[PDB]
Amino acid sequence: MNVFEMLRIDEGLRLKIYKDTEGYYTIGIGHLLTKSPSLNAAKSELDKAIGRNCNGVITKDEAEKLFNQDVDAAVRGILRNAKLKPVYDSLDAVRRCALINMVFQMGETGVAGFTNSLRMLQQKRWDEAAVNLAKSRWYNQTPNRAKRVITTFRTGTWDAYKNL
Numbered sequence: 001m002n003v004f005e006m007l008r009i010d011e012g013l014r015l016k017i018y019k020d021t022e023g024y025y026t027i028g029i030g031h032l033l034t035k036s037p038s039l040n041a042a043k044s045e046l047d048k049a050i051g052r053n054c055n056g057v058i059t060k061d062e063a064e065k066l067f068n069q070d071v072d073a074a075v076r077g078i079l080r081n082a083k084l085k086p087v088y089d090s091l092d093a094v095r096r097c098a099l100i101n102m103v104f105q106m107g108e109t110g111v112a113g114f115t116n117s118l119r120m121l122q123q124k125r126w127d128e129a130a131v132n133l134a135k136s137r138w139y140n141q142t143p144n145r146a147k148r149v150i151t152t153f154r155t156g157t158w159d160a161y162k163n164l
Contacts, residue, residue, distance in 0.1 A: 001158045003071065003097045007104060009164050010145050013063060017042055017056045021142055028063030030104065031070060074104045083112045090122050098152040105145075106138065121153060130154040 011030030017039065020026045025033045025042035033045045039056075046054050050062055058066075078084040078099065088099055099121075102111050112118075114136070120129035130150050133139065139146040151160040 001161060003100050004067070006097055006158075006161055007067075007071070007101060009161055010101065010105075010148065013060075015058055015060070015063065017046065027058060027066075029067040029070075031063075031066045070104060071100070074100050077108045078103055081108050081112060083118065084108065087118050087122050090124075092156055094156050094158065095121070095153055098149050101149050101152075102138075126154050126156075 008029060013029055014027060017025055017027050017033070020030070020032070024035050025039065025045075027033060027046060031049075033042045033049070036042070043054070043056050046056065046058070049066065050058060078088050084099070084103070088096060091099065099111070114133070117129050117132045120132060130153060133150050133153065134146070136146075139150075148160040148164075152158070
Protein backbone atom coordinates (compact mmCIF):
# COMPACT_ATOMS: atom_id res chain seq x y z
CA MET A 1 0.00 0.00 0.00
CA ASN A 2 1.18 3.56 -0.72
CA VAL A 3 -0.04 7.05 0.11
CA PHE A 4 -1.97 7.27 -3.12
CA GLU A 5 -4.04 4.17 -2.48
CA MET A 6 -4.47 5.25 1.11
CA LEU A 7 -5.89 8.62 0.16
CA ARG A 8 -8.01 7.16 -2.61
CA ILE A 9 -9.67 5.03 0.03
CA ASP A 10 -10.26 7.97 2.36
CA GLU A 11 -11.50 10.49 -0.16
CA GLY A 12 -13.22 8.48 -2.85
CA LEU A 13 -13.34 9.52 -6.55
CA ARG A 14 -16.10 11.80 -7.92
CA LEU A 15 -16.24 13.11 -11.49
CA LYS A 16 -18.92 15.74 -10.94
CA ILE A 17 -18.79 18.79 -8.51
CA TYR A 18 -19.85 17.60 -5.09
CA LYS A 19 -20.09 18.88 -1.55
CA ASP A 20 -17.61 17.56 0.97
CA THR A 21 -18.40 16.56 4.56
CA GLU A 22 -18.13 20.26 5.51
CA GLY A 23 -20.40 21.26 2.67
CA TYR A 24 -17.67 22.62 0.40
CA TYR A 25 -17.52 22.32 -3.31
CA THR A 26 -15.03 19.55 -4.25
CA ILE A 27 -14.26 17.38 -7.27
CA GLY A 28 -12.15 14.27 -8.00
CA ILE A 29 -10.12 12.79 -5.18
CA GLY A 30 -10.82 15.26 -2.39
CA HIS A 31 -9.79 18.38 -4.38
CA LEU A 32 -11.35 21.38 -2.64
CA LEU A 33 -12.50 23.93 -5.13
CA THR A 34 -13.83 26.76 -2.98
CA LYS A 35 -15.27 27.41 0.46
CA SER A 36 -17.75 29.77 -1.28
CA PRO A 37 -21.43 29.00 -1.40
CA SER A 38 -21.70 29.62 -5.04
CA LEU A 39 -21.78 26.63 -7.36
CA ASN A 40 -20.87 29.21 -9.86
CA ALA A 41 -17.77 30.32 -8.03
CA ALA A 42 -17.01 26.54 -8.01
CA LYS A 43 -17.42 25.95 -11.66
CA SER A 44 -15.15 28.86 -12.28
CA GLU A 45 -12.42 27.54 -10.06
CA LEU A 46 -12.81 24.24 -11.69
CA ASP A 47 -12.24 25.56 -15.21
CA LYS A 48 -9.25 27.56 -14.04
CA ALA A 49 -7.82 24.45 -12.41
CA ILE A 50 -8.28 22.20 -15.49
CA GLY A 51 -7.68 24.68 -18.21
CA ARG A 52 -10.92 23.93 -20.05
CA ASN A 53 -14.61 24.66 -19.84
CA CYS A 54 -15.68 21.77 -17.82
CA ASN A 55 -19.16 22.55 -17.05
CA GLY A 56 -18.81 20.83 -13.54
CA VAL A 57 -17.53 17.59 -14.84
CA ILE A 58 -14.06 16.08 -15.38
CA THR A 59 -12.53 12.84 -16.70
CA LYS A 60 -10.67 10.20 -14.65
CA ASP A 61 -7.41 11.45 -16.10
CA GLU A 62 -8.15 15.03 -14.97
CA ALA A 63 -9.00 13.85 -11.47
CA GLU A 64 -5.79 11.88 -11.23
CA LYS A 65 -3.81 14.82 -12.51
CA LEU A 66 -5.26 17.01 -9.71
CA PHE A 67 -4.56 14.25 -7.25
CA ASN A 68 -0.89 14.05 -8.29
CA GLN A 69 -0.56 17.80 -7.78
CA ASP A 70 -2.24 17.83 -4.40
CA VAL A 71 -0.08 15.03 -2.95
CA ASP A 72 3.07 16.76 -4.25
CA ALA A 73 1.98 20.07 -2.76
CA ALA A 74 1.18 18.33 0.59
CA VAL A 75 4.65 16.76 0.72
CA ARG A 76 6.47 19.99 -0.24
CA GLY A 77 4.37 21.90 2.24
CA ILE A 78 5.43 19.60 5.08
CA LEU A 79 9.09 19.94 4.02
CA ARG A 80 8.87 23.70 4.07
CA ASN A 81 7.04 24.01 7.25
CA ALA A 82 9.16 24.59 10.38
CA LYS A 83 6.78 22.80 12.66
CA LEU A 84 6.08 19.90 10.33
CA LYS A 85 9.44 19.02 8.84
CA PRO A 86 11.16 17.91 12.00
CA VAL A 87 8.26 15.62 12.77
CA TYR A 88 8.24 14.17 9.31
CA ASP A 89 12.01 13.61 9.41
CA SER A 90 11.73 11.78 12.69
CA LEU A 91 9.11 9.30 11.43
CA ASP A 92 9.27 5.88 9.76
CA ALA A 93 7.84 5.45 6.21
CA VAL A 94 4.26 4.38 7.10
CA ARG A 95 3.81 7.03 9.77
CA ARG A 96 5.09 9.53 7.25
CA CYS A 97 2.06 8.55 5.08
CA ALA A 98 -0.23 9.24 8.04
CA LEU A 99 1.05 12.84 8.36
CA ILE A 100 0.73 13.35 4.61
CA ASN A 101 -2.92 12.25 4.91
CA MET A 102 -3.73 14.76 7.68
CA VAL A 103 -2.04 17.55 5.70
CA PHE A 104 -3.92 16.70 2.54
CA GLN A 105 -7.29 16.80 4.44
CA MET A 106 -6.79 19.73 6.71
CA GLY A 107 -3.98 21.88 5.31
CA GLU A 108 -0.53 22.57 6.79
CA THR A 109 -1.84 25.22 9.06
CA GLY A 110 -4.44 23.02 10.52
CA VAL A 111 -2.01 20.21 11.26
CA ALA A 112 0.61 22.60 12.62
CA GLY A 113 -2.06 23.46 15.29
CA PHE A 114 -1.83 19.98 16.77
CA THR A 115 1.17 21.09 18.94
CA ASN A 116 0.89 18.50 21.63
CA SER A 117 0.22 15.54 19.35
CA LEU A 118 3.17 16.54 17.12
CA ARG A 119 5.45 16.61 20.16
CA MET A 120 4.27 13.15 21.16
CA LEU A 121 4.83 11.68 17.74
CA GLN A 122 8.27 13.17 17.66
CA GLN A 123 8.96 11.52 20.93
CA LYS A 124 7.60 8.23 19.61
CA ARG A 125 4.92 7.97 22.29
CA TRP A 126 2.45 6.19 20.03
CA ASP A 127 -0.29 5.35 22.50
CA GLU A 128 -0.27 8.74 24.04
CA ALA A 129 -0.32 10.56 20.81
CA ALA A 130 -3.32 8.41 19.57
CA VAL A 131 -5.33 9.41 22.60
CA ASN A 132 -4.44 13.10 22.17
CA LEU A 133 -5.23 13.19 18.43
CA ALA A 134 -8.77 11.80 19.20
CA LYS A 135 -9.56 14.91 21.23
CA SER A 136 -10.24 17.16 18.30
CA ARG A 137 -13.00 18.44 16.09
CA TRP A 138 -11.30 16.42 13.33
CA TYR A 139 -12.01 13.13 15.10
CA ASN A 140 -15.53 14.09 16.11
CA GLN A 141 -16.49 15.16 12.58
CA THR A 142 -14.92 12.30 10.53
CA PRO A 143 -14.46 9.56 13.09
CA ASN A 144 -13.94 6.53 10.79
CA ARG A 145 -11.35 8.26 8.63
CA ALA A 146 -9.70 9.79 11.78
CA LYS A 147 -9.55 6.32 13.41
CA ARG A 148 -7.86 4.89 10.32
CA VAL A 149 -5.17 7.61 10.50
CA ILE A 150 -4.79 7.39 14.20
CA THR A 151 -4.33 3.57 14.00
CA THR A 152 -1.65 4.11 11.40
CA PHE A 153 0.23 6.45 13.83
CA ARG A 154 -0.41 4.03 16.67
CA THR A 155 0.85 0.84 14.98
CA GLY A 156 3.12 1.89 12.24
CA THR A 157 1.37 -0.58 9.90
CA TRP A 158 -1.31 -0.53 7.14
CA ASP A 159 -3.73 -2.64 9.15
CA ALA A 160 -6.51 -0.04 9.20
CA TYR A 161 -6.66 -0.06 5.48
CA LYS A 162 -6.12 -3.76 4.74
CA ASN A 163 -9.67 -4.34 5.31
CA LEU A 164 -10.83 -1.64 2.83
